[PDB]
Amino acid sequence: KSYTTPKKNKHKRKKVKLAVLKYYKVDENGKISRLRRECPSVFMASHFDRHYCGKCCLTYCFN
RNA sequence: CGGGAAACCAAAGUCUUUGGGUUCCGGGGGGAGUAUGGUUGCAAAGCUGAAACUUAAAGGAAUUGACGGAAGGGCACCACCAGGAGUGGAGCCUGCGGCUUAAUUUGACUCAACACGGGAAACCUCACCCGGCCCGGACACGGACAGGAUUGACAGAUUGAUAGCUCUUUCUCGAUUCCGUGGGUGGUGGUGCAUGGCCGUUCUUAGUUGGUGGAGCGAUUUGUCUGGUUAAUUCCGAUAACGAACGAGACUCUGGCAUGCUAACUAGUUACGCGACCCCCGAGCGGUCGGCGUCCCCCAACUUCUUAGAGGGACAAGUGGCGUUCAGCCACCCGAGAUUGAGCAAUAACAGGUCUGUGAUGCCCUUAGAUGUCCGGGGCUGCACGCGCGCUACACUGACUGGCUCAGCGUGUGCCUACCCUACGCCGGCAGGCGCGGGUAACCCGUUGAACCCCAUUCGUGAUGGGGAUCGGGGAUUGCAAUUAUUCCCCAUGAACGAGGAAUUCCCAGUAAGUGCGGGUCAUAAGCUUGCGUUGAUUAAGUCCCUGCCCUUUGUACACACCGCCCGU
C-alpha cells in the first residue's frame, strides 16, 4: 500500500469550456467557417500531433 | 443445671436477676524487661524499672480450602515395574529465538507453544519495507451552475508500465460532479487486562448443588457415612435425616454372527443350463472330465458371498467355589461371556487463545502526503549459533535385477466460475504428448490385479553397490512471472553416519512395530496432518517406588493459598 509522504503531486487535469474559445468563425448567416478540423459526426481536431474523439474514438495518426 | 469468643468447664457455676471475706496483678502492639538510679551477689546474674520515637493493627477459638520431605484406603502407561519400538547422536524438510536486513510482519512460551493460526507465502494471500493509480468522501450546510462546473482518451518528455500520474490542456456523463464546515462509512490498525461467541486446560478422574429437617449465635455442617463392594457418591447396607436434580450409567454411531426374512442388469450371481465359442490343452483313441482370456436374452435357479432395512442376539444366564452370605468377585461347558473403539459430557473457574474468521462489537488510532483499497518488483526462505515435531539410514533377515500374486475408506466436470477423475490406440527411454471413448458415478476409471512380504541371479564385512546430502550440465510440465534453482526426469560428484552420553516420550491385542494407499491443503503438491488396509510379537493381568489424581483422619505462623510465608550479621 502507499505509505509514504512523497508523491510530489496527485490531482486532475481540470478541463474548462468556461473560457472564450471559438470553434467556428463569426460569418454571415448561412455560412459558417471552421477554424480547426471538426466533424459533423464534433471534436477531432489536432491535439498537438494526433487526432482522437470522445463520441467516436477514431485515432488518426498519419494524415 | 449453668457459664463462655469458642475449644472447654461440677468449675472456668451460683454474673446487668451484678455486693461471702481478702491478696497480687493487666490496659493495643513494638522501644523492653533496654538505659539510668537504688539494692543483693565472690562471678554469672536476680529484685525495683522509665521516656523519646515508631505502628493500624498485633493477638485467641472455630469453619471452608490450599499445602505437607504426615500417616490410612484406591485408581491412571499424558506414571513406574517387565518389555518393544523410538527421540537426543549424522544428513536433511518445516516451526522458534538471536544475529541481519528497507522489511527479514505478527500471535503463542511446562504439560496447556515451538509440522500450532488446515501458516506447504513466486504474484495474489500480505497485515512488513521501497514507488505509482483511486476516492467505491452517504447526506446537508454555502459557492462554483450558462464564455456553464466536472468524465476521460493516444501528445512528446516523463514514468518503471502505451497510469491524458503529472507536465500538459481538449473533450464530456453534463448539474449525479468540484472546494470548506459537520458526520467517517472504510481498515489483518492498538487493547483477548472492556467484551460476545467458539475452543483449551484445572480433570478423564468422579465429583456437584439446593428444598424441608437437626446441630452451632456464627462462618459452616449433616444428607455426601462406620463397612464390604465395584471402572464409578455404582450398590447393598449403616443412619438425625427425608424426599429429589446434575455428572456416571443410561443414549447415538461403529465392529463382530445370524445358511432365517422383503429384495435386487448399476451387485453377486456362477450353483446351473453347458444354449454356445477355443486350445489335444492332459489321465482320457474320444466323450464325461479341467479350463476358459470368453457370449448371451430373460421366456433360467436364486441370495451363501455384495449392499442395507426390520429383526434377532448377552442378561452374573447355566454350574462350582469365595462372600456379613446382600452388594458382588474368581473359574468353567455354552457362545458375540457380561470386555471394540469412539461421540456425548456436570459444579466453580483461568484476567488460558483468539478483536489476524466473521456486517458481532466498545473505546482509542487513522481516513486523502490514507493505518481504505488496486498495481509493480521484491521480503516472510537470509547464517558464526542453540533449539522442538519429523523422513532417511548406518546394512547380508540387506541392496541391485527378474518372476509372482493379494486390500479397504473415500474421491472425480460448468458452482456467485474455470477446470475434474481416466481407461484404450499410436509418438517418446523416461519425465511427457496427440486423436480420442466413457463418468454428476454399485454403471467406464476400478473384479481398484499397491507395497514390505513369496521364489531365483549379483554383490561378500570392505564408507562396499549401505547412505543418498552437495554441486555442474542437460529434458519436459502447470502458470501473467520459476532467477534466491515450483515440481518431475537424465547423466554425473558420492560427503556426514559403524546402532548413538546425560536425559526422555509412546504403547499392553489385530494394539506395538513395517510397508503401501486415500482425504486435506492443491492452477504447480507433499518428508505434514486427517483416515484405510495389509504383515504381524516379545512383556505384563500389578504396585504405589518416581511424576501426578479422588475420598477420609490429623497439622499450619499459608489465603494473588509452598511458585507460600519468614529469620539475623
Side-chain angles (χ1 to χ4, degrees):
Chain A
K1 305 171 194 179
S2 289
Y3 299 112
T4 59
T5 290
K7 186 56 79 76
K8 181 262 294 170
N9 215 350
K10 56 187 309 299
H11 84 99
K12 303 178 167 194
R13 298 180 306 116
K14 64 152 281 303
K15 299 301 175 304
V16 293
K17 81 170 186 175
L18 177 59
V20 167
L21 198 67
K22 299 290 100 175
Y23 325 118
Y24 306 109
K25 203 158 56 48
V26 183
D27 296 64
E28 50 195 356
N29 277 281
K31 179 178 175 295
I32 191 171
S33 303
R34 318 189 175 193
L35 313 189
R36 307 164 68 174
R37 188 160 98 172
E38 290 176 0
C39 299
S41 62
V42 191
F43 284 90
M44 185 64 73
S46 298
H47 299 68
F48 321 97
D49 64 2
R50 298 192 191 205
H51 309 263
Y52 194 86
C53 187
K55 294 178 189 173
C56 204
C57 288
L58 276 164
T59 287
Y60 287 77
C61 202
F62 313 91
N63 305 335

